[PDB]
Design a protein around this ligand. Sequence first.
Ligand SMILES: *[C@@H]1O[C@H](CO)[C@@H](O[C@@H]2O[C@H](CO)[C@@H](O[C@@H]3O[C@H](CO)[C@@H](O)[C@H](O)[C@@H]3O)[C@H](O)[C@H]2NC(C)=O)[C@H](O)[C@H]1NC(C)=O
Ligand SMILES: *[C@@H]1O[C@H](CO)[C@@H](O[C@@H]2O[C@H](CO)[C@@H](O)[C@H](O)[C@H]2NC(C)=O)[C@H](O)[C@H]1NC(C)=O
Lengths: 197, 190
Amino acid sequence: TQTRFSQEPADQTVVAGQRAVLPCVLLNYSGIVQWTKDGLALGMGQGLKAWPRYRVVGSADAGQYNLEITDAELSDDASYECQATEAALRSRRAKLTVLIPPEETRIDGGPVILLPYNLTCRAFNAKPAATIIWFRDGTQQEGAVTSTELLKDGKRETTISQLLIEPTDLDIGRVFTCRSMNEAIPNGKETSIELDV
Amino acid sequence: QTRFSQEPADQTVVAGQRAVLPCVLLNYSGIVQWTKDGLALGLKAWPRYRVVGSADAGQYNLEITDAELSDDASYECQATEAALRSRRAKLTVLIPPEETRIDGGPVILPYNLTCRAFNAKPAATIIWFRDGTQQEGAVTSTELLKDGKRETTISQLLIEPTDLDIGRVFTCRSMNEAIPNGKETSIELD
Ligand SMILES: *[C@@H]1O[C@H](CO)[C@@H](O[C@@H]2O[C@H](CO)[C@@H](O[C@@H]3O[C@H](CO)[C@@H](O)[C@H](O)[C@@H]3O)[C@H](O)[C@H]2NC(C)=O)[C@H](O)[C@H]1NC(C)=O
Ligand SMILES: *[C@@H]1O[C@H](CO)[C@@H](O[C@@H]2O[C@H](CO)[C@@H](O)[C@H](O)[C@H]2NC(C)=O)[C@H](O)[C@H]1NC(C)=O
């Protein structure tokens, strides 16, 4: 009747600036428990030095060694496992998906775009690829061309939706708003721009 | 600040042999650990595992005695306490063939032969010869095994027995990188 894992860590989805805990409890264990981050060790005891926002918590008595990450970051998006030494085995794979909202998304037309012309809304630095929705006052799906652009680090993307407008004496004074949301964002941010001929 | 003067390298070790992985880090005050396929490592509760070298000069080399197929893994001497990982160490643990024999029995009275090397890494090569190398006819065909690490090479020989070859011995040798000189099984034609 050796050591076992009552609960092993599972794949969790966390948004940026949030707290996460990975369920790792192993009964019949008095031995040291470690954590693996892409093949990297964390720390001995329940005090993880030289690491920011990393602290293992839970019941030391019940064999519970849950890792706690506060204020999640793009860096934390990785694979984890709470393996233990002293004749103990590893513990599953933990894919941490740290979702991040788009930043300062706007339409490449300025405050007002005076002029078969075009508009385009661009979402920047979001993972997963944020979705752009085009509408003046009611959804104008017609024309919207969603195109995803991968970023430097290859983890996040920059979706750009090119709109096929054809301005007239009507659309003048009429605002064209563009919202952009992702799994990190329930209700996307919007930029209000003014058309002109 | 702290660095790795020498990092572990991909090493080839034969079965039942001793290996050391070079890991020396200057200007270090942190504890140094080792990684085996994303697993942490005087290594208790484990046999033949002992890290050695000079703690004073910063040398932390890993020592493995009596190598085995299980030890075939990826390693790195990463350190805790604000320290980084250290390269990748692909340890190739070579193993000799086991019980290689000819599927003809002690004596095999348009016939065929085949010598079969079993459970060797890398795939052992079979060489056919009565008294001098008779590569002609030998058909080497490698067969991978369940765990996909080792193989079972089988060389089928295209013989055609006659009144001459009787009493004449047919030996079959099988060698690999783990075996400089392969073992041979002697069979009698009839
Ligand atoms: C004696 O050993 C020789 C050498 O292996 C055997 O000759 C082999 O005969 C088989 C047919 O029975 C050939 O297999 C064929 O391969 C093709 C693929 O290229 C496949 O599509 C066919 O359906 C067929 O299976 C094989 O090529 C041939 N070997 C050589 C080197 O020519 C012979 O069968 C053995 N005899 C005995 C009694 O064991
Ligand atoms: C307005 O936006 C549309 C949408 O992309 C652009 O149309 C593209 O035109 C090029 C030809 O130069 C094609 O290769 C692309 O396939 C077209 N896109 C689509 C979705 O069909 C058009 O170029 C833009 N006009 C501008 C920016 O002045």
